[PDB]
Amino acid sequence: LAFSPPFYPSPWANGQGEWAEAYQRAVAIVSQMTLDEKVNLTTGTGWELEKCVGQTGGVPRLNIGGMCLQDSPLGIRDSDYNSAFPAGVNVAATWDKNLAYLRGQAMGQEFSDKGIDVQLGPAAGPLGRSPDGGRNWEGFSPDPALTGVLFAETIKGIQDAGVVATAKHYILNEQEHFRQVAEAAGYGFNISDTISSNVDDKTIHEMYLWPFADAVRAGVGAIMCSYNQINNSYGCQNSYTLNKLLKAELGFQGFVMSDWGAHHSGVGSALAGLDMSMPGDITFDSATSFWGTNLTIAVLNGTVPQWRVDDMAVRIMAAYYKVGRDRLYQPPNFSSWTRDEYGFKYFYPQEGPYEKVNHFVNVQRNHSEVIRKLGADSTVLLKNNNALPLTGKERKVAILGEDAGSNSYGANGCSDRGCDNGTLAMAWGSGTAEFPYLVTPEQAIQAEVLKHKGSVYAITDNWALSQVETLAKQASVSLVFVNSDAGEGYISVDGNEGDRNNLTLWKNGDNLIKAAANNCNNTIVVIHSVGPVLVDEWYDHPNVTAILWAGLPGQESGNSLADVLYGRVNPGAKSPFTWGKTREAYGDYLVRELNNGNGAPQDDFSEGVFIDYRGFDKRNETPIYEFGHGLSYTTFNYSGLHIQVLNATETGAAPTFGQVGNASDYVYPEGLTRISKFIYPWLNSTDLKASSGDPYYGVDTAEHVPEGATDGSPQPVLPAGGGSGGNPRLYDELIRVSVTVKNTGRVAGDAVPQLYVSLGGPNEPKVVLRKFDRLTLKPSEETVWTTTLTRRDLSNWDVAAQDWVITSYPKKVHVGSSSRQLPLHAALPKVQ
Amino acid sequence: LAFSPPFYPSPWANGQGEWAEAYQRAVAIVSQMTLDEKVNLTTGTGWELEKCVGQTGGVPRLNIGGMCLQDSPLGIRDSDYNSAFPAGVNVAATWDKNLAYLRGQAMGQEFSDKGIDVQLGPAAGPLGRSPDGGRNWEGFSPDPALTGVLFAETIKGIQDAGVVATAKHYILNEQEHFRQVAEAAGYGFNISDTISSNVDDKTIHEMYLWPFADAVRAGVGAIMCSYNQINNSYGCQNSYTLNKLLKAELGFQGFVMSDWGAHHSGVGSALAGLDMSMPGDITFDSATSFWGTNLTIAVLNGTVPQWRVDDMAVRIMAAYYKVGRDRLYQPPNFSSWTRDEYGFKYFYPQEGPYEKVNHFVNVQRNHSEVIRKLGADSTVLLKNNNALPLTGKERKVAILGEDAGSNSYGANGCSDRGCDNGTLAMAWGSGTAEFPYLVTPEQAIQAEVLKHKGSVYAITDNWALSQVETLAKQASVSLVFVNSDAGEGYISVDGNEGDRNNLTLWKNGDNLIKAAANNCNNTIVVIHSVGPVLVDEWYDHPNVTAILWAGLPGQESGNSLADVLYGRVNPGAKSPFTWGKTREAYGDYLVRELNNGNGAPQDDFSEGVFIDYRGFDKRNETPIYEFGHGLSYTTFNYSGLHIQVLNAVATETGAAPTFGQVGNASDYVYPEGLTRISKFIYPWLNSTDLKASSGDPYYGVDTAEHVPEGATDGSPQPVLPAGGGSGGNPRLYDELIRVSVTVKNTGRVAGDAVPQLYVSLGGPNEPKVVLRKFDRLTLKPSEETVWTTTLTRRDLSNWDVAAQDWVITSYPKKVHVGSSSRQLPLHAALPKVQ
Numbered sequence A: 001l002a003f004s005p006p007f008y009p010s011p012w013a014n015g016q017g018e019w020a021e022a023y024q025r026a027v028a029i030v031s032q033m034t035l036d037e038k039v040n041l042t043t044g045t046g047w048e049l050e051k052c053v054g055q056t057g058g059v060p061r062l063n064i065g066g067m068c069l070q071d072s073p074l075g076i077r078d079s080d081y082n083s084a085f086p087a088g089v090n091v092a093a094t095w096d097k098n099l100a101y102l103r104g105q106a107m108g109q110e111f112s113d114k115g116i117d118v119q120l121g122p123a124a125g126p127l128g129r130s131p132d133g134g135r136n137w138e139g140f141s142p143d144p145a146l147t148g149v150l151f152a153e154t155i156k157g158i159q160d161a162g163v164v165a166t167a168k169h170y171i172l173n174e175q176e177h178f179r180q181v182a183e184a185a186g187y188g189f190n191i192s193d194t195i196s197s198n199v200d201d202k203t204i205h206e207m208y209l210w211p212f213a214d215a216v217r218a219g220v221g222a223i224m225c226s227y228n229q230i231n232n233s234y235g236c237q238n239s240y241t242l243n244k245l246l247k248a249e250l251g252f253q254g255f256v257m258s259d260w261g262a263h264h265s266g267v268g269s270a271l272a273g274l275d276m277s278m279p280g281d282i283t284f285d286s287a288t289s290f291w292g293t294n295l296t297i298a299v300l301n302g303t304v305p306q307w308r309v310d311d312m313a314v315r316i317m318a319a320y321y322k323v324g325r326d327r328l329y330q331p332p333n334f335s336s337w338t339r340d341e342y343g344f345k346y347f348y349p350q351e352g353p354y355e356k357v358n359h360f361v362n363v364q365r366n367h368s369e370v371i372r373k374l375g376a377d378s379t380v381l382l383k384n385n386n387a388l389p390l391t392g393k394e395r396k397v398a399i400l401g402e403d404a405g406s407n408s409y410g411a412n413g414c415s416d417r418g419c420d421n422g423t424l425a426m427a428w429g430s431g432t433a434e435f436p437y438l439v440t441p442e443q444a445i446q447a448e449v450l451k452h453k454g455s456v457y458a459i460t461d462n463w464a465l466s467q468v469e470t471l472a473k474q475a476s477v478s479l480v481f482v483n484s485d486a487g488e489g490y491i492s493v494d495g496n497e498g499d500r501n502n503l504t505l506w507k508n509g510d511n512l513i514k515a516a517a518n519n520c521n522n523t524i525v526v527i528h529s530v531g532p533v534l535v536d537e538w539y540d541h542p543n544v545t546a547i548l549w550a551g552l553p554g555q556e557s558g559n560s561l562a563d564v565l566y567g568r569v570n571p572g573a574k575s576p577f578t579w580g581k582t583r584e585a586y587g588d589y590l591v592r593e594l595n596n597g598n599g600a601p602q603d604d605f606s607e608g609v610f611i612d613y614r615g616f617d618k619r620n621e622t623p624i625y626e627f628g629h630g631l632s633y634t635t636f637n638y639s640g641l642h643i644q645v646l647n648a649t650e651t652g653a654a655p656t657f658g659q660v661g662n663a664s665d666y667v668y669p670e671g672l673t674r675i676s677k678f679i680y681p682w683l684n685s686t687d688l689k690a691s692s693g694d695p696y697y698g699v700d701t702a703e704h705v706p707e708g709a710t711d712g713s714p715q716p717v718l719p720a721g722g723g724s725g726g727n728p729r730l731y732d733e734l735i736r737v738s739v740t741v742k743n744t745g746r747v748a749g750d751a752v753p754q755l756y757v758s759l760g761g762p763n764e765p766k767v768v769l770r771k772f773d774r775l776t777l778k779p780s781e782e783t784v785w786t787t788t789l790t791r792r793d794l795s796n797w798d799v800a801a802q803d804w805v806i807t808s809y810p811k812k813v814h815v816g817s818s819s820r821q822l823p824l825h826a827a828l829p830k831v832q
Numbered sequence B: 001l002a003f004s005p006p007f008y009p010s011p012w013a014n015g016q017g018e019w020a021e022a023y024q025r026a027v028a029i030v031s032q033m034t035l036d037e038k039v040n041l042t043t044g045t046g047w048e049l050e051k052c053v054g055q056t057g058g059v060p061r062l063n064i065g066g067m068c069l070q071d072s073p074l075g076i077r078d079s080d081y082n083s084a085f086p087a088g089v090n091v092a093a094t095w096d097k098n099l100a101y102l103r104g105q106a107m108g109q110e111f112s113d114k115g116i117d118v119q120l121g122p123a124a125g126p127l128g129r130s131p132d133g134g135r136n137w138e139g140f141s142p143d144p145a146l147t148g149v150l151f152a153e154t155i156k157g158i159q160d161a162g163v164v165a166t167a168k169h170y171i172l173n174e175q176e177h178f179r180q181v182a183e184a185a186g187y188g189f190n191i192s193d194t195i196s197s198n199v200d201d202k203t204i205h206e207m208y209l210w211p212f213a214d215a216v217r218a219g220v221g222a223i224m225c226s227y228n229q230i231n232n233s234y235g236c237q238n239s240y241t242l243n244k245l246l247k248a249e250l251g252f253q254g255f256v257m258s259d260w261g262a263h264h265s266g267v268g269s270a271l272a273g274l275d276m277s278m279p280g281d282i283t284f285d286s287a288t289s290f291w292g293t294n295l296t297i298a299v300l301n302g303t304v305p306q307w308r309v310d311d312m313a314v315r316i317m318a319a320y321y322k323v324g325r326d327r328l329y330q331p332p333n334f335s336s337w338t339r340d341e342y343g344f345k346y347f348y349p350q351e352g353p354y355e356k357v358n359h360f361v362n363v364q365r366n367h368s369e370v371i372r373k374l375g376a377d378s379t380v381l382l383k384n385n386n387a388l389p390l391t392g393k394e395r396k397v398a399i400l401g402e403d404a405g406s407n408s409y410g411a412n413g414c415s416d417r418g419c420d421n422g423t424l425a426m427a428w429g430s431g432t433a434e435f436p437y438l439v440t441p442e443q444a445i446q447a448e449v450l451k452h453k454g455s456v457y458a459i460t461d462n463w464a465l466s467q468v469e470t471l472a473k474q475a476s477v478s479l480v481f482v483n484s485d486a487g488e489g490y491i492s493v494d495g496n497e498g499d500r501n502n503l504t505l506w507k508n509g510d511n512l513i514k515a516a517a518n519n520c521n522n523t524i525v526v527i528h529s530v531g532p533v534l535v536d537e538w539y540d541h542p543n544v545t546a547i548l549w550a551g552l553p554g555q556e557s558g559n560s561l562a563d564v565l566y567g568r569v570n571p572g573a574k575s576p577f578t579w580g581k582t583r584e585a586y587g588d589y590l591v592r593e594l595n596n597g598n599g600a601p602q603d604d605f606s607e608g609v610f611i612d613y614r615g616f617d618k619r620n621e622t623p624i625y626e627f628g629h630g631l632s633y634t635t636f637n638y639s640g641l642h643i644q645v646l647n648a649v650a651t652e653t654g655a656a657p658t659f660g661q662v663g664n665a666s667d668y669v670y671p672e673g674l675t676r677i678s679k680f681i682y683p684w685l686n687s688t689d690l691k692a693s694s695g696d697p698y699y700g701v702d703t704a705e706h707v708p709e710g711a712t713d714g715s716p717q718p719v720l721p722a723g724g725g726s727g728g729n730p731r732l733y734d735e736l737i738r739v740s741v742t743v744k745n746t747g748r749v750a751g752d753a754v755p756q757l758y759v760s761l762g763g764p765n766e767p768k769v770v771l772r773k774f775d776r777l778t779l780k781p782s783e784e785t786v787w788t789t790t791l792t793r794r795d796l797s798n799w800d801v802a803a804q805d806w807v808i809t810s811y812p813k814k815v816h817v818g819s820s821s822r823q824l825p826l827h828a829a830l831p832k833v834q
């Protein structure tokens, strides 16, 4: 079985870089705290005990309000009067740094105004190893460079709006199947521990770790560790990923929180690098915690050194101050658990004062604008045989497909979106938000046709093929809507347990397109989906004149699309993944059956870096639509490639901040009514053992504490460490690349120039993406695009050296419009 | 068994009044015609042989194109790029003469521009005897006065636009059950003839006949006779309804066409007063006809007088010239049978030149405006506890009910609208048009909310009550949509065979309302339906703050309603029928079982004139919402009732004329150089052997016995006492009393009032009040106006069966003026007038 080597001690924060001020203020306030106050910062108060999906008790005596942590990566979950933004995968389709940033800012503002302190997103894990992975759509792209830039830009958006962003899920949660023991059981599988992602050290650095390094460098204040094991060590107590990779190598200065139920030990986790336990209990509403009372006891009994809990508290506070949250603070002014105005203050036991729990604050501002735009700018034109834009003079328009119409239960009529009815604007699970409304394609396209006095109908039953065929024969254009859905593992739709059972269109979608195309010579396909689908059966039909993929556009869906169909917006989006001929073309098989008896299933990432396009290119498979592909209403030319060569070893000792006293000091205060199921930092009595209630209390302790876990002495700085996101030499710019881009068509538009390198060597991908931009050119207009390659961009991870190395194989640079359309190349000069 | 007395001969046209010029021209052209030409005018060419739902062959030698007859009373049927207008019951709800006329004009324009010569509408039969009749919605109101005025204005709009209108169905087709033998058989009922409406002479004059008198007087060109029997004589060969009531008493100068399959004899029908056979064959595509060849022969063998056939031709030509159809003629430029551009000329057998059958002519203009406006002006505000209008500042709006959303099969995805899926904007059967589009309440209300940055959702599955309650609890206002559907008897939806099985909301409507009202203190109900529905379970719920009935609005439904909900339009519509507490409160039971063995079911109209509000008033039963009831966003006051008395014809017809000559049988044999299209109905004979050419098993059998006394009598006839003009003796239209009242807008916003003028004619068996006059008046806040109207002699008369005439009885009469049939603050005794 794969094994996860220990790395210890857990590195302490140090005021690195842009963290110096936040750190100093964190240390000044933590220095005034008692042990039980510090422990309060680290432990949620229990599932559904307060307002937010996760919530800490705070430090009342120091005016630090409890920290309110709320989903999702795409808008406020479980609230009201909030916006529903497009999914991360749409942000990726835009290839637009500035849109990523604006969508972050827009969300941040909304979160801030609800009294939320920490947004549980954005997401870059799953990266997207498998096309049928249930949560890939929450993230960005299976490409590390694309994902890392847009992930970093989203984080900066959120955090400049004064909310803490949480980069999740760290790391390797590449599938929903077997991610949780209790979920596995509800689906009929018996496992004793969650699925183990088993991955070699090179693959992890070159692929899955890379966006987290960008997040770290961008200043992210929190990271959420994952439900799965990595080499048979749980993600939320993996000393390797947390202490070595995240804190020592990437130099992360913020706080690591657990996924909800991903906390599996008190002492183990704390020493392996975890800083915050969510939602605070061991299981939901168990009234027990691996931390809280236990963490207090563990410090008092000498097992967890004080400097470790001091550091958790400094990391949590430094992040809070880093985004300016102290200046924006207000208690959460909604409840995640009821929409009632009034309710008991503590929802789960229904205890505490009966008072206002919802204030109905409308935080939407004008966010529908950026939503509508981002939807339009994320609609990839995959095929256009001269069919689009529509002119509005189409005599008769057939809108066809359930995916064009309304959810008969209302836009939010399915809990956490756990269905696929009517238009698909949002996939399912925690990664969701309540719509304020939903503009369907039917509504926006019928409104458009009616503005021009045309005739128009929507058929939204996908087995009404008789009606479809009759209408299609009468129509000047047929717009056919199809989708494919997925989501988080705790919800199953039509037998898809999170992950997609297949990449085929849902609800009769292939048969619907064929029924339309067999009858309109101008049949136009619009796909809403969480990732690629199989188009093989109809994409080259002679009557299929255009095909668009619109992702999961959020609340303005129909207007986003209408904007593109009718030429208000020239699509510039590019596919952020590959569209293969068959499922098999992707390889990268999800683990769907027990392969380790009733122990943890073993998920061997035995293809290495070769996911999505890297794998298609390696096997010489030709995708129907390649990574980076998207058409425009204009054409571009790329020419004139020019290349130009450009010109701490130890940490401090772990500090302690403030004083720890006797057990007496941490016993439950006498005046306090203990709320049922509420998690507190206090002890029943000065008897440590009895106050813990742990059947293993005091037994074999030192043997269960790995070597070095309590070593507070100065430590070696890793060669690839020493900065933020890695050693700062990694970000030295070594080569400047320039090309001329011209708009050679007749429509103002955006180009997405894409720069790939070949690093060389028998185990490297043929091409890997490194730089891109989105450039707005009018007809005939030209621009020079210039970009630089850093030391990191040119390197491969060398496991012997434990560092990035520019290997001696010759390297090449490629510039064009997609991973397969690269008309400019050059050998790069040797650099080092 | 009820018996229908003979009335012969069949009255001939005389150029009566406004018909003079059209008659003269018809006579000049029919004088030039051969017998077989004349026959061609009288007989359709066979089901689906040509373009229109009905079509004659015309007279090619005289450059007269075949007449194209097309449904429906609310927009062109079976075509493309036409409009779909609100149903005739919506016109009734407007109580607006001007809107009836404008809708008529917009329809006639579209029909005209398709090359259609005759619109198969509007409808005033059924009148609305039973609240559950399947076709009431195609007509207007169970009130004769309201219905007749709006019927006439509709006819006038159509005909001023250059298309012949057809007043249908004549007469007493008050239900769908048993209306047709093969229809009843398909539903498991074995009858040898169709349902017989059995009505007394006073009831028929005072109720069912009255709107047809208005039609005749307004100049209607065509009348369509009905499927039912009247006292066991078929609608389309009943010499009493056709010869006596319609042609002699009302003095009708145009032509009588059959309903499709309603023609049941050649000789008997022609002598009883039919003028045209549609679609032309005995049954669809039987390649036999009671007319065509048979009518040619019936003249050649002396059984049908030449003057009778000449009279058919003159009435058809006269209706055609009367609307100026000749100045607008073009062949129909669409096909009812296919939407293909190209096809065989003769659809049913697939024969003839393969050529262009569809031109896709866009006839709609900006008619969506009159449709949007009329939908809005026919939305009746039944209840409003200061809930409406909405301001757009509502934070969260819940749109609740299937009836708010889309038909998932597309707006036209049920053939002849034969389902109740999604929003109800058109009921089912032949009274339908293809929508060009359909704006749902969901679309229009969501667009409105979003215009104000509010929050909004539609839940459109009526059993998703869990989601309904959860949403209703968070809403500022819940808009709940419910419907009740019906249609022509050839289509059954959910076992409703034309007629509704009950008056209860469809698709869980009551439970939906209760699920919402139990949770929003601001629950607002919108009803789309063919007529009244049972409201007792929820109308007085403390949480139901407003209730609207919007009928069947046609293509702009959602925009009509939003205009009303958000106060762009102050609603002024008034209920054109009664909302009772129970089905039983209306009495007036449909005949739903065989009650005469396997013979024709007998439908006795025992209630007499006591239908809808007349019956409620007789029985002292209190409607939930009375006939005439409608709220407004303003208030109106009625005062200063005054009455002023005012100062205010041949006795024989000519002899029956004949125009042109009849020659030998051999003149009428199939022309030799002519290919005979399969199923096509021609006027021609196979040989000079009459008997064999006819193929009639009954040819020359007991012929004299089956020709009723007087039926061939071409000599001058007495003029009936109640006859001698258009829509009755012209003395009936003398204005005898002027009425005036001041109507004032006492509220804060502009709006329309609908003053209503009722009379009590007096007598032990007269309704307590019957409507006579109304108008719709637009008033600014504080504005006053003097509403003035007049009562005619007809208005004050009762039908006296012994005189056979209208008579003002000696019982004291009163006038009552107010805002509904139960809200009548002003009363005045009338002085003796005669």
Ligand SMILES: *[C@@H]1O[C@H](CO)[C@@H](O[C@@H]2O[C@H](CO)[C@@H](O[C@@H]3O[C@H](CO[C@H]4O[C@H](CO[C@H]5O[C@H](CO)[C@@H](O)[C@H](O)[C@@H]5O[C@H]5O[C@H](CO)[C@@H](O)[C@H](O)[C@@H]5O)[C@@H](O)[C@H](O[C@H]5O[C@H](CO)[C@@H](O)[C@H](O)[C@@H]5O[C@H]5O[C@H](CO)[C@@H](O)[C@H](O)[C@@H]5O)[C@@H]4O)[C@@H](O)[C@H](O[C@H]4O[C@H](CO)[C@@H](O)[C@H](O)[C@@H]4O[C@H]4O[C@H](CO)[C@@H](O)[C@H](O)[C@@H]4O)[C@@H]3O)[C@H](O)[C@H]2NC(C)=O)[C@H](O)[C@H]1NC(C)=O
Binding pocket: A003, A004, A005, A006, A007, A192, A193, A232, A233, A234, A237, A238, A239, A264, A265, A266, A267, A268, A269, A272, A289, A290, A291, A294, A295, A297, A298, A301, A302, A303, A692, A694, A696, A697, A698, A699, A700, A701, A702, A703, A704, A705, A706
């Ligand atoms: C001060 O107060 C403190 C607060 O109250 C007191 O704190 C308590 O101290 C106790 C010990 O005194 C703790 O109890 C013991 O904990 C250990 C660790 O359990 C967790 O971690 C397991 C992974 O372990 C590795 O990794 C973590 C870091 O992630 C390290 O810290 C460990 O050192 C260890 O590291 C090695 O491996 C990694 C690579 O993986 C390397 O990198 C290193 O180099 C090392 O090689 C993990 O597997 C555990 O998971 C179990 O528990 C989960 C939580 O419920 C559950 O979801 C999992 O499914 C799994 O369940 C199974 O196991 C548990 C028992 O642990 C059963 O109840 C359950 O039914 C399942 O069977 C967990 O997350 C733990 O391993 C110890 O248990 C072993 O040893 C005892 C005997 O001492 C046996 O009875 C057990 O059966 C068990 O045996 C297994 O392991 C042995 C090898 O160690 C092997 O010999 C056996 O054959 C067998 O396989 C104890 O449970 C306690 O957690 C802690 N409480 C709190 C609140 O923090 C403190 O005592 C007091 N101080 C003083 C001075 O008084």
Ligand SMILES: *[C@@H]1O[C@H](CO)[C@@H](O[C@@H]2O[C@H](CO)[C@@H](O[C@@H]3O[C@H](CO[C@H]4O[C@H](CO[C@H]5O[C@H](CO)[C@@H](O)[C@H](O)[C@@H]5O[C@H]5O[C@H](CO)[C@@H](O)[C@H](O)[C@@H]5O)[C@@H](O)[C@H](O[C@H]5O[C@H](CO)[C@@H](O)[C@H](O)[C@@H]5O[C@H]5O[C@H](CO)[C@@H](O)[C@H](O)[C@@H]5O)[C@@H]4O)[C@@H](O)[C@H](O[C@H]4O[C@H](CO)[C@@H](O)[C@H](O)[C@@H]4O[C@H]4O[C@H](CO)[C@@H](O)[C@H](O)[C@@H]4O)[C@@H]3O)[C@H](O)[C@H]2NC(C)=O)[C@H](O)[C@H]1NC(C)=O
Binding pocket: B003, B004, B005, B006, B007, B192, B193, B232, B233, B234, B237, B238, B239, B264, B265, B266, B267, B268, B269, B271, B272, B289, B290, B291, B294, B295, B297, B298, B299, B301, B303, B694, B696, B698, B699, B700, B701, B702, B703, B704, B705, B706, B707, B708
């Ligand atoms: C020149 O060319 C012409 C064209 O080719 C030739 O025209 C043909 O002439 C024949 C006569 O020679 C015609 O055949 C006879 O027709 C009659 C009438 O049938 C129709 O009307 C019936 C209702 O009739 C009344 O009302 C009409 C007007 O509405 C009058 O015109 C009638 O005079 C009669 O009037 C009385 O009643 C009304 C009140 O209703 C009063 O107001 C009047 O004062 C009078 O009292 C109607 O019921 C018929 O309906 C049947 O047929 C329909 C299909 O067409 C069908 O939908 C119905 O369900 C119904 O079917 C039942 O009956 C038919 C036969 O008619 C059966 O086949 C069928 O299967 C069912 O049983 C129709 O609409 C008709 O009455 C005659 O038949 C009666 O008499 C014959 C014997 O003479 C019997 O064999 C029959 O069984 C039948 O018996 C009934 O009536 C008797 C009363 O007299 C009674 O004694 C019996 O007991 C019984 O109940 C003949 O069929 C033929 O229609 C016509 N063809 C064309 C194309 O026009 C012409 O001959 C030729 N000239 C010369 C000189 O050569």
Ligand SMILES: *[C@@H]1O[C@H](CO)[C@@H](O[C@@H]2O[C@H](CO)[C@@H](O[C@@H]3O[C@H](CO[C@H]4O[C@H](CO)[C@@H](O)[C@H](O)[C@@H]4O)[C@@H](O)[C@H](O[C@H]4O[C@H](CO)[C@@H](O)[C@H](O)[C@@H]4O[C@H]4O[C@H](CO)[C@@H](O)[C@H](O)[C@@H]4O[C@H]4O[C@H](CO)[C@@H](O)[C@H](O)[C@@H]4O)[C@@H]3O)[C@H](O)[C@H]2NC(C)=O)[C@H](O)[C@H]1NC(C)=O
Binding pocket: A036, A037, A040, A045, A056, A057, A058, A059, A060, A061, A066, A353, A671, A672, A673, A674, A675, A678, A681
């Ligand atoms: C870790 O996190 C958790 C979660 O955030 C922290 O737990 C919270 O800690 C709070 C203390 O900081 C504690 O707050 C208490 O709430 C009680 C309930 O308040 C509500 O109900 C009342 C009653 O009708 C309303 O007045 C009020 O607005 C609330 O709606 C309060 O009762 C407590 O107030 C008392 O203490 C505060 C100072 O904190 C005084 O200002 C206040 O006047 C009250 O003081 C009396 O009680 C204290 C007992 O400590 C006495 O010292 C003082 O002399 C007063 O005594 C008189 O009155 C009492 C009874 O009223 C009488 O018996 C006595 O004889 C005197 O006459 C206080 O505000 C939260 O409840 C608690 N949350 C939960 C879920 O448990 C935790 O502290 C964190 N841990 C660390 C180390 O930071």
Ligand SMILES: *[C@@H]1O[C@H](CO)[C@@H](O[C@@H]2O[C@H](CO)[C@@H](O[C@@H]3O[C@H](CO[C@H]4O[C@H](CO)[C@@H](O)[C@H](O)[C@@H]4O)[C@@H](O)[C@H](O[C@H]4O[C@H](CO)[C@@H](O)[C@H](O)[C@@H]4O)[C@@H]3O)[C@H](O)[C@H]2NC(C)=O)[C@H](O)[C@H]1NC(C)=O
Binding pocket: B036, B037, B040, B045, B056, B057, B058, B059, B060, B061, B066, B353, B673, B674, B675, B676, B677, B680, B683
């Ligand atoms: C009662 O109503 C019916 C139906 O309206 C009438 O029947 C129609 O009568 C017309 C006019 O008489 C018939 O028209 C004839 O059509 C022939 C075929 O037309 C098409 O096919 C050719 C093939 O290439 C095309 O060129 C042509 O444009 C059409 O597309 C024509 O060939 C005829 O013109 C010539 O025909 C005769 C040949 O015998 C010659 O003597 C002449 O040279 C002449 O130019 C003619 O136009 C039509 O077919 C009938 N319809 C049906 C369904 O049968 C009755 O006439 C009417 N009865 C009365 C008494 O009015």
